[PDB]
Amino acid sequence: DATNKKRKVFVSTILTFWNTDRRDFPWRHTRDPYVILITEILLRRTTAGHVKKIYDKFFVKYKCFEDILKTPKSEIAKDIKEIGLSNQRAEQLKELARVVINDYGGRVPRNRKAILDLPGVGKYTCAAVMCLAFGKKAAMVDANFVRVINRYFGGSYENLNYNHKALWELAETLVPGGKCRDFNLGLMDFSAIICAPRKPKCEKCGMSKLCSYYEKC
Ligand code: SF4
Ligand SMILES: [Cl-]
Ligand SMILES: [Cl-]
Ligand SMILES: [Zn+2]
């Protein structure tokens, strides 16, 4: 149906944004599974700017899970106090390190279900590791991704969130093969710069012509 063109323009718009208004963060320049997974965990409950500021010292000190597991919890907490909830985060990092060391030889598995079951890992982080580290097709769906989908596609997707399989399935089918990274990261950037939480910047949006939400305005 014509829903084919609407989906095609969405993907096209996002892929282009990845090349025209790309944001930058250190973790977007590595493919080490450990760094990507740990960074996604550190980003929770804080901001990219905060993690970016401890990134250099953190990854020089903790080069892998072995480094985390041998370090006292209080020392780890001290090292990441800046991003908050340091003690709770330290405890979680050590548990994750313990499982990866005890069960996977200290290396993150290149398998969806294996990753998803690691301590502290949810559907979004698992998607990030699979896509960013292993280059496998996966949609990194967070609340911001949901927002764009709600607005652009509307209809039966207007009120769904990432706890709805119907919404995650659509996201999955939108991910272009061979360019999962371009799509997920381009969408992350687009959602923040253009289709923002407060007053999307529709006049700068390239797909406003097919956007459901743009019609209600
Ligand atoms: S037209 Fe507006 S609401 Fe629609 S995708 Fe673009 S920014 Fe988001
Ligand atoms: Cl490389
Ligand atoms: Cl290692
Ligand atoms: Zn190691």
Curated annotation (Swiss-Prot):
Pfam families registered for this protein in UniProt: HhH-GPD
Organism superkingdom: Archaea
Sorted alphabetically, the keyword list is:
4Fe-4S, DNA damage, DNA repair, Glycosidase, Hydrolase, Iron, Iron-sulfur, Metal-binding, Plasmid
Task: Pinpoint the HhH domain residues.
Answer: 103-131
Cofactor(s) demanded: [4Fe-4S] cluster
| Record EC number | 3.2.2.-, 3.2.2.29
Example of a GO biological process term: mismatch repair
* UniProt GO MF annotations: 4 iron, 4 sulfur cluster binding; 8-oxo-7,8-dihydroguanine DNA N-glycosylase activity; adenine/guanine mispair binding; G/T mismatch-specific thymine-DNA glycosylase activity; metal ion binding; oxidized purine DNA binding; purine-specific mismatch base pair DNA N-glycosylase activity
Q: Where does [4Fe-4S] cluster bind?
A: 195, 202, 205, 211
* Cofactor: binding details: Binds 1 [4Fe-4S] cluster. The cluster has a structural role.
Q: What is the effect of changing residue 142 to A?
A: 15-fold lower activity
Q: What class of enzyme is it?
A: hydrolase
Family matches, as InterPro entries: DNA_glycosylase, Endonuclease-III-like_CS2, Endonuclease3_FeS-loop_motif, Endouclease-III_FeS-bd_BS, HhH-GPD_domain, HhH_base_excis_C, MIG/MutY
Q: Which reaction does it catalyse?
A: Hydrolyzes mismatched double-stranded DNA and polynucleotides, releasing free thymine
What this protein is reported to do is described as:
DNA glycosylase that excises thymine from T/G mismatches and uracil from U/G mismatches. Acts as a repair enzyme able to counteract the mutagenic effect of spontaneous hydrolytic deamination of DNA 5-methylcytosine (5-meC) residues that leads to the formation of T/G mismatches. May also repair U/G mismatches arising from hydrolytic deamination of DNA cytosine residues. G/G, A/G, T/C and U/C are minor substrates.
User: What family is this protein classified in?
Assistant: Belongs to the Nth/MutY family.
| Record protein name field | Thymine/uracil-DNA glycosylase
Q: Which organism is it from?
A: Methanothermobacter thermautotrophicus (Methanobacterium thermoformicicum)
